[PDB]
Write a protein that binds this ligand. Structure first.
Ligand SMILES: [Co+2]
Ligand SMILES: [Mg+2]
Ligand SMILES: [Mg+2]
Lengths: 209, 209
């Protein structure tokens, strides 16, 4: 009942955010990525588990839109950014994720993200460029927190959804993949946990007052 | 605040499903589209409003994947299929949608679909091909019912989510865009209404015993 593997039909939810050099996942550089796995305690409450974060070197041949760099404030040419390759970052994320899937008894990872298709498309595109094998993420399914917040909170904008959920949100950190990932993780957890607390889950709960 | 315009920050949710001749929204034919707008009654319960459905003629130059046609059973060359152009289909959908946005006091439409990125990408591609102006749909936001069902019902597959929610689901109709759209609409409505009924909405309800 209270196992993570039982909650989402065997899907292992992993929160992801990316910063990029444009809107096109095929052609534009991936610049930052963070990942936060989740776990469930003995009573079935969801919380963050492992957190990873990387500055990513633009792939060879990548386009970099000036408007994108102006938006997120990232300078990919700054040698002090401590960047790593797409391979290094994703290989590390996938290793932690496979470990969590195994240890929890899940069978596949699913990406949790805000307007998820965007992050999913960039992560998948980078995975293919790096030639990583046995990608543990579902190839098309996601848990979009904008839609989820729409239901739970009546809000679709990340900052606003967080504020409505009673969370802090610091706009000076809003262009950091890591920061956005942590806020998104806490938001997703607040949504799932309040669903449970109000007797929405497990399905049996409503008849046991 | 039991108006539709109050529920999703001014978004007017419209349920959409598509059948296609493949996986690529840019290059593969759109073959069927259905749309169901929603309304809320005086007490704030959500339900279907207007239903549209179309068999769609492959755009000129479209690719058609044999595997896609074998999957959905559609023969685009059958002259008895009562097909209309992408323009005709989307022009009518958009007209009904603009009307509902105005009548409800909303400011924009948001697509509700199962694994929503897929249908969004196809509908948007057809809109562009048809040279339609003033598309009332949000350019990237959606309400994915697979993610919503994951939260509400612990299931992400459409047929299973419907069954878990106590709905009928007839697998012999699963390749009809209209059928899938109506089931998805009923599922979305069940999820929204159960969150309200259990005291998750409006946000003030939890403290009003
Ligand atoms: Co026919
Ligand atoms: Mg983001
Ligand atoms: Mg479908």
């Amino acid at each position: 009942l209270t196992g993570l593997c039982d909650r989402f039909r065997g899907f292992y939810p992993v929160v992801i955010d990316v910063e990029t050099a444009g809107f096109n996942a095929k052609t534009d550089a991936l610049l930052e990525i963070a990942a936060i796995t989740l776990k469930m305690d003995e009573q079935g409450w969801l919380m963050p588990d492992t957190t990873l974060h990387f500055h990513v070197e633009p792939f060879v041949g990548a386009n970099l839109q000036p408007e994108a760099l102006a938006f997120n404030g990232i300078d990919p040419n700054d040698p002090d950014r401590g960047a790593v390759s797409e391979y290094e970052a994703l290989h590390e994320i996938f290793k932690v994720v496979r470990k969590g899937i195994k240890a929890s008894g899940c069978n596949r990872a699913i990406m949790v993200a805000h307007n998820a298709n965007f992050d999913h498309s960039f992560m998948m595109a980078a995975a293919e460029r790096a030639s990583l094998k046995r990608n543990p993420f579902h190839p098309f399914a996601t848990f979009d927190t904008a839609a989820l917040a729409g239901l739970a909170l009546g809000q679709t904008v990340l900052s606003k959804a967080c504020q409505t959920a009673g969370m802090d949100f610091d706009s000076t950190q809003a262009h950091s993949a890591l920061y956005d990932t942590e806020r998104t993780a806490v938001l997703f957890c607040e949504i799932v946990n309040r669903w449970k607390r109000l007797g929405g889950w497990p399905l049996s709960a409503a008849e046991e007052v």
